[PDB]
Amino acid sequence: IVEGSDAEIGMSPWQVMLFRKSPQELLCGASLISDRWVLTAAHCLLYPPWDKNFTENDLLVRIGKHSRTRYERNIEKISMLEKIYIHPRYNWRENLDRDIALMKLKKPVAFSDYIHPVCLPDRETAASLLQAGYKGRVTGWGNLKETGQPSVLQVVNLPIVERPVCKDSTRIRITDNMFCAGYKPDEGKRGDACEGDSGGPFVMKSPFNNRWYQMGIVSWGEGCDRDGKYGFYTHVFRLKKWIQKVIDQF
């Protein structure tokens, strides 16, 4: 996260860390959506142009973490992957369309003050909150600068940006399965997700029921926190049918 701030303890208890077994490193962010399902970006597990194709046994999920590098004894829980599920139409060839994936855990994770699932939006949460101007919150342990690393979880609040402005910021083809978020140059305020924040959640707090909903997944960008550029996010509600299908079936 660039130009964000340290997370508060228990501020994002759905936050998940995708952690590579060997070499032991940060793979990506992710989100806890129930006691056995974790949501992330497909590009975190599959990206052929970069020779990325991870299977279940190549990683673990670390839940309830704050410190990036520390093994947080008696706080985090580390869980093994039973099965990975990537959107069958995930378009890694061109624009990361449908950049989404589910991970089923071997065993349920126990909720705690530090471990708690985020809600997924329904059609009305989406219509109500996914509006240009409205801010979301992005969290992760990624790069503090486009080109260093944080000691603890970073957080940044960012406004959702108008669709034409998103489209006019990039040569990449944008779809209905994406939205972009970030401050304009003229607004002065800064911030962005960056490398390593991939797969982490973009959340909004409903003013109606005071619950946190995950509206986006950190998907892509061109550089980090650059003027005139915006972070792009997987539109979670637009891919809800697939989420429920996977979870209903498996």
Binding site: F19, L26, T69, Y71
Partner: peptide, 10 residues
């Protein structure tokens, strides 16, 4: 640079 996690976790 990352602290080792319990061997049980592998």
């Amino acid at each position: 640079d990352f602290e080792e996690i319990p061997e049980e976790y592998l």
